């Protein structure tokens with residue numbers, strides 16, 4: 105909408121106060137004009153028609169319980185935009201400052217979130233498996249990263265290419281969580297999953313097997329559930345990424361860690377320069393090796409660590 109840029113204040117899903125960029129024209133709208141062609145947050149009003157209505161508020165204060173998922177979807181989309189721009193020199197998900205759109209209050213008791221090809225969508229959860237899913241910065245950044253993948257490598261969402269697609273979203277979701285630097289970890293979804301259970305999460309990158317996901321190619325899932333295991337076999341790649349950054353010895357193979365920033369540079373370059381829609385795990389290894397070679401040189405520790413990490417998870 106046409107209006108003037110304003111700054112509202114509200115409380116997110118976890119009870120934290122934050123400022124949000126809004127637009128004033130009669131109402132205050134969740135429309136942030138400070139980033140690219142805008143970040144726009146919509147109310148789906150417990151239905152499944154998308155996007156719903158651009159979020160309107162009478163007073164620019166967003167402290168109602170109903171407001172909290174919208175505050176966080178809007179704010180964390182901004183953090184994610186900032187990460188890609190500041191760290192990778194990428195302007196929005198398409199590289200050309202495309203508007204970022206999110207809808208909250210999708211359906212009733214909906215225990216998921218997604219990128220639908222055009223926008224992000226967040227359920228409220230049922231209050232037991234999940235609370236509103238936009239409360240997790242790693243979740244928001246995971247979903248927006250699917251848009252980045254859409255516009256770059258285009259990894260088909262099935263089998264190994266789909267597991268890479270998922271792992272890319274978990275990797276960058278985690279790197280955005282570290283960028284914001286509020287209670288960062290190598291777990292996925294911990295802030296919004298199972299409010300009655302402390303210390304759990306949806307997936308773990310540091311130890312995928314904690315939640316039943318493979319941490320070695322020999323343990324990959326080969327069945328048809330979950331589009332051929334895209335959220336299961338992602339553990340093999342998540343573990344490799346964790347090892348590249350943090351180091352460790354895994355099934356007897358030692359990896360020298362090179363840190364999160366270099367992990368992000370290597371995988372961003374692989375995603376945008378080398379991966380294709382049909383890339384498999386072996387082709388990801390080759391893409392990561394070539395990316396690290398471009399950035400750091402063939403004789404570098406960074407290249408050696410990429411190779412050790414893929415060896416450790418059984419990907420040749």
Ligand SMILES: N[C@@H](CCCC[NH3+])C(=O)O
Pocket residue numbers: 215216217306335
């Ligand atoms: N986002 C993942 C994990 C489940 C999230 C809620 N059931 C999926 O759609 O499979």
Ligand SMILES: [Ca+2]
Pocket residue numbers: 161162163164165166167
């Ligand atoms: Ca208000």
Ligand SMILES: [Ca+2]
Pocket residue numbers: 163165166167
């Ligand atoms: Ca109010």
Ligand SMILES: [Ca+2]
Pocket residue numbers: 281286287288289294295
């Ligand atoms: Ca965390």
Ligand SMILES: [Ca+2]
Pocket residue numbers: 242278281288289290291292293294
């Ligand atoms: Ca996390």
Ligand SMILES: [Ca+2]
Pocket residue numbers: 294296297298299300301302303304305
């Ligand atoms: Ca929990």
Ligand SMILES: [Zn+2]
Pocket residue numbers: 217218
């Ligand atoms: Zn997903």
Ligand SMILES: [Zn+2]
Pocket residue numbers: 246250270273
């Ligand atoms: Zn995903």
